[PDB]
């Protein structure tokens, strides 16, 4: 079949014989790796998806009995086989045939089940695909923190975000996609929508209080100056606190779909933002505060502020319990979690002050103390 | 007899199982290690041989010892990963010569190169000047080709090779279904 | 030509896969021998019996051979079994208590 | 702590079990405790940065068993014991 | 047979294990050379709450009682309350038990 391959290798399209030249040269020189990289070039070429279907079977064969190269090349080309073919019925036989074919030398079975579950993330199945996704993250907690496989796992949790069940685990994995991005080589033209539903998904993730982790990471705000800055402004307001209800009102109605049923819960989230900011505002000098600034921050009545502080204690970001009879708001611990340069500088201020006070008392006791006691 | 230490640097890339050349010539050069270590054992049995790869994370597979019996075992479980690393493959042996027991054992390091070299000529002259500085007998054994075998590797050897009388030799093997074994046994380095 | 050699290679792989079991079972016994060799190094314990406890940590012991001593308490065990009426076990060094001695 | 110490550590993470690392000092001019136990564990990070071997401090104490106390105390004759009262309290209360 | 060529490393490991049992098996002969006296054994099972309880009660021929777990090698006809046993000097261990009559 090797001299029988020279016909259909030689006989080909108009522009393909340029890469059939080096493809037949590396084919005759029988270097499986250079032939492999030429296959990655030919799949990487935007071919017509018309005359490639025979070489899908041909280098599917040569890739099966080549028994040499890391078969993730075969994984990617067979993903392009099913992407060209759109036949999930034989795709399971293909992927299972690779599972029987790929022995245990390198555990690429995480990318196998990633591919299988990925194709099973069609409308046919959701639950057991999610369960074998849970198996994919369950398999290797070892040293391969390469995260290429695990950014493909983020693609699996993105198709799990196509299920409207969970905003949060897509956002928890979107922190991991926030950390596993390398450079801007992947499509800015894509990164518009990546940052767009990343921002909407960051908002609609309902297991979080802060947005300053997302806005803190600079590759997103450097990817969103291309984007229209109506959204960076309100994520900056949702990070830094809404002293207004008009701007967060206009973006509360700017995003039209699905935001009404979430909207009151988002009010319940951003009404905690002013709380944690106003208890992070005054470090000392009458830490005690009152409900009038809270309700003035929240345009809410005094009948609901007990419900508001009960909710704030119900989240558990604050431990403050107020011993008042006449209405007062005394606070304890909350987490800053975002940044404040004024608290960097005030940190240096009270920090240096504490240092020279402890030094002052140490010299003060120690001067007469060493001379009388030693 | 001949009092010297032997260091080998072995390829573990997937370029050593390619179906053009010998059927996993990793085995063939492993048997070349067997015949040169038993031939050095027959010449002077007290010569010590260390074993290490050219991967990213190189690992001393066996510390330098004249007991090659377990070196025969350590030549297996080769872990065919990675591609190549040239510089720390040199530095991982040439400075590790100073840990040796017999200080009268002279310095000899070879390397089995089955991948194209990733280092530029600027690093080739820093390392060739580095080894010609510390004066180690270095025999360069280059298996397989994608581009030409020696273009800058030639002047890498000539700038690496001082001491024109009985200095180091260069091994350049052509393609051939003949072995690597008797073909590298053709210079005086086997003998 | 071709169809026979996969079955024959199944037979060569058979005769190679049948020679490991003659070693891998008795290597458990061989490693078990040195597991025992690490188990026989715990030596030199003596016995004793508790009648009267003056300090809650440190009390009077009564040896089988006759001479009486006072001992301490080990940081691992607690005062449950250390109540009197309990025959115990002791060490030559430091007179410590590793565990007790149940009568029969 | 050099960059190489993950790889130097990795050899004894392989052949030995999970190995502990100790940073001590070449010159004991540090008034603080010279020994710091750094557990060799990989921890998952909230920023999304890929998982790497991370050296978290495990708290340490320096104790001697029996005879090391006797030999050290015989070698010194300079250190004083617990000695509650004025001096050993008030010197800690000095420095 | 490429998957079955990893068996060679396993066999070299196990014949290496047979190379290295010679020394720790060699100390069996020099530790277990002479059971110096004869001591009465009374078998008494213990409980530790592995941490399993396993014990025996010893009485020397000079009527001195000590403490020890069940120790020695793999025992089948042992575990009896019997006599004529193997013992080293102050280790007071069990090495070689024999029937008296």
Care to describe what's here?
The structure is cut from a larger assembly and holds chains A (374 residues), B (191 residues), C (104 residues), D (95 residues) and E (101 residues). Chain A has 374 residues and is mainly α. Chain A is 63% helix and 0% strand. Chain A contains 19 helices and no strands. Chain B is α/β, with parallel strands linked by helices and 191 residues long. The N and C termini of chain C lie far apart (76 Å). A 3-stranded antiparallel beta sheet of chain D has the order 1-2-3. The radius of gyration of chain D is 19 Å and the shape is elongated. At the A-B interface, helix 3 of A face loops of B. Strand 1 (45-50) of chain C pairs antiparallel with strand 3 of chain E, so a sheet runs across the interface. Chain B: One of its GO terms (biological process) is proteasome-mediated ubiquitin-dependent protein catabolic process. Chain B: Residues 5-188 form the VWFA domain. Chain B: Keywords: Isopeptide bond, Phosphoprotein, Proteasome, Repeat, Ubl conjugation.
Concise overview:
This is part of a larger assembly, with chains A (374 residues), B (191 residues), C (104 residues), D (95 residues) and E (101 residues). With 95 residues, chain D is of the alpha+beta class.
Compile the SSE list and pairings.
The structure is cut from a larger assembly and holds chains A (374 residues), B (191 residues), C (104 residues), D (95 residues) and E (101 residues).
Chain B: E1 4-10, H1 25-43, E2 49-53, E3 62-65, H2 71-74, H3 87-94, E4 106-113, H4 121-134, E5 137-142, H5 152-160, E6 170-172, H6 181-184
Parallel strand pairs in B: 1-2, 1-4, 4-5, 5-6
Antiparallel strand pairs in B: 2-3
Chain C: H1 2-17, H2 21-24, H3 26-39, E1 45-50, E2 60-62, E3 68-70, E4 87-91, E5 97-100
Antiparallel strand pairs in C: 1-2, 1-4, 2-3, 4-5
Chain E: H1 7-24, H2 26-31, E1 39-43, E2 56-60, E3 66-68
* Biggest interface, chains and residue tallies: C-E, 34 and 32 residues
Q: In terms of quaternary structure, what is this? A: part of a larger assembly
Which class do the helix and strand fractions of chain C yield? alpha+beta
Please provide the ordered H/E string of secondary-structure elements of chain C.
HHHEEEEE
For the report, how would you describe the main beta sheet of chain D?
3 strands, antiparallel
Strands across the major sheet of chain D, in which order? 1-2-3
Would you list the SSEs of chain D in sequence order as H and E?
Answer: HEEEHH
Please report the distance between the alpha carbons of the first and last residues of chain D: 30 Å
What is the strand content of chain D? 15-25%
Sum up the overall morphology of chain C in one term: rod-shaped
Radius of gyration of chain C: 28 Å
PDB class: hydrolase
Keywords: p28, 26S proteasome, regulatory particle, 19S, gankyrin, hydrolase
Entry title: Conformational Landscape of the p28-Bound Human Proteasome Regulatory Particle
Chain A: 26S proteasome non-ATPase regulatory subunit 13
């Amino acid at each position: 079949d090797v001299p029988g391959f020279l016909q259909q290798s030689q006989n080909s399209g108009p522009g393909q014989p340029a890469v059939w030249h080096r493809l037949e040269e590396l084919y005759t020189k029988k270097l499986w790796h250079q032939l492999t990289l030429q296959v990655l070039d030919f799949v990487q070429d935007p071919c017509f998806a018309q005359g490639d279907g025979l070489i899908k079977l041909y280098e599917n064969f040569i890739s099966e009995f080549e028994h040499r190269v890391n078969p993730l090349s075969l994984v990617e080309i067979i993903l392009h086989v099913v992407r060209q073919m759109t036949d999930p019925n034989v795709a399971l036989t293909f992927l299972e045939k690779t599972r029987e074919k790929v022995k245990s030398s390198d555990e690429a079975v995480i990318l196998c089940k990633t591919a299988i579950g990925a194709l099973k993330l069609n409308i046919g199945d959701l639950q057991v695909t999610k369960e074998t996704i849970e198996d994919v993250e369950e398999m290797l907690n070892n040293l391969p923190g390469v995260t290429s496989v695990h950014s493909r796992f983020y693609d699996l949790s993105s198709k799990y975000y196509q299920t409207i069940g969970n905003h949060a685990s897509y956002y928890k994995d979107a922190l991991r996609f926030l950390g596993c991005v390398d450079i801007k080589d992947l499509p800015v033209s894509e990164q518009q929508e990546r940052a767009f539903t990343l921002g909407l998904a960051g908002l609609l993730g309902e297991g979080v209080f802060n947005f300053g982790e997302l806005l803190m990471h600079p590759v997103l705000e450097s990817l969103r100056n291309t984007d229209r800055q109506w959204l960076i402004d309100t994520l900056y307001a949702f990070n830094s606190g809404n002293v207004e209800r008009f701007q967060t009102l206009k973006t509360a109605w700017g995003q039209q779909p699905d935001l009404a049923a979430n909207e009151a819960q988002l009010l319940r989230k951003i009404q905690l933002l002013c709380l944690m900011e106003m208890t992070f505002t005054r470090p000392a000098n009458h830490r005690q505060l009152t409900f009038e600034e809270i309700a003035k921050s929240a345009k809410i009545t005094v009948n609901e502020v007990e419900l508001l502080v009960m909710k704030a204690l119900s989240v558990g970001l604050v431990k403050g319990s107020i011993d008042e009879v006449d209405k007062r708001v005394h606070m304890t611990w909350v987490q800053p979690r975002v940044l404040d340069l004024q608290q960097i500088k005030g940190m240096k201020d009270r920090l240096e002050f504490w240092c020279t006070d402890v030094k002052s008392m140490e010299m003060l006791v120690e001067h007469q103390a060493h001379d009388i006691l030693t | 007899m001949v009092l010297e230490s032997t260091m080998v640097c072995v390829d573990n890339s997937e370029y050593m199982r390619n179906g053009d050349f010998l059927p996993t010539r990793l085995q063939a050069q492993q048997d070349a290690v067997n015949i040169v270590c038993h031939s050095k054992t027959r010449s002077n049995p007290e010569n010590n041989v260390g074993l290490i790869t050219l991967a990213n994370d190189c690992e001393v597979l066996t510390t330098l010892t004249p007991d090659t019996g377990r070196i025969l075992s350590k030549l297996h479980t080769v872990q065919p990963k990675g591609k190549i690393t040239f510089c720390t493959g040199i530095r991982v042996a040439h400075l590790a010569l100073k840990h040796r027991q017999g200080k009268n054992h002279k310095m000899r390091i070879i390397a089995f190169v089955g991948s194209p070299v990733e280092d530029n000529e600027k690093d080739l002259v820093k390392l060739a000047k580095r080894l010609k500085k510390e004066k180690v007998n270095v025999d360069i054994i280059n298996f397989g080709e994608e581009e030409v075998n020696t273009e800058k590797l030639t002047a890498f050897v000539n700038t690496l090779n001082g001491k024109d009388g009985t200095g180091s030799h260069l091994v350049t093997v052509p393609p051939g279904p003949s072995l690597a074994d008797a073909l590298i046994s053709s210079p005086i380095l086997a003998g | 030509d071709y169809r026979k050699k996969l079955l024959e290679h199944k037979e060569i792989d058979g005769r190679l896969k049948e020679l490991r079991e003659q070693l891998k079972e008795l290597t458990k016994q061989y490693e078990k021998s040195e597991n025992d060799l690490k188990a026989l190094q715990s030596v030199g314990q003596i016995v004793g019996e508790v009648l009267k406890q003056l300090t809650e940590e440190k009390f009077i012991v009564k040896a089988t051979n006759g001479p009486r001593y006072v001992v301490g308490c080990r940081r691992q065990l607690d005062k449950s079994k250390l109540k009197p009426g309990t025959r115990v076990a002791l060490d030559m060094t430091t007179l410590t208590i590793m565990r007790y001695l149940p009568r029969e | 702590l050099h960059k190489n110490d993950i790889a130097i550590n990795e050899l004894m993470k392989r052949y030995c079990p999970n190995s502990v690392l100790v940073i001590i000092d070449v010159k004991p001019k540090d008034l603080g405790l010279p020994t710091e136990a750094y557990i060799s564990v990989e921890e998952v990070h909230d920023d999304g940065t890929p998982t790497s071997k991370t050296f978290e401090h495990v708290t340490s104490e320096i104790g001697a068993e029996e005879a090391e106390e006797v030999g050290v105390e015989h070698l010194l004759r300079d250190i004083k014991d617990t000695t509650v009262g004025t001096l050993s309290q008030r010197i800690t209360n000095q420095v | 047979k490429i998957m079955k060529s990893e068996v060679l490393r396993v066999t070299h490991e196990l014949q290496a294990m047979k190379d290295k049992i010679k020394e720790n098996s060699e100390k069996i002969k020099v530790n277990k050379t002479l059971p110096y006296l004869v001591s009465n054994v009374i078998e008494l099972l213990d409980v530790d709450p592995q941490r399993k309880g396993k014990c025996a009660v010893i009485k020397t021929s000079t009527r001195q009682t000590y403490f020890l777990p069940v120790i020695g090698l793999v025992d089948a006809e042992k575990l009896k309350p019997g006599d004529l046993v193997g013992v080293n000097k102050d280790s007071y261990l069990i090495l070689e038990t024999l029937p008296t009559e």
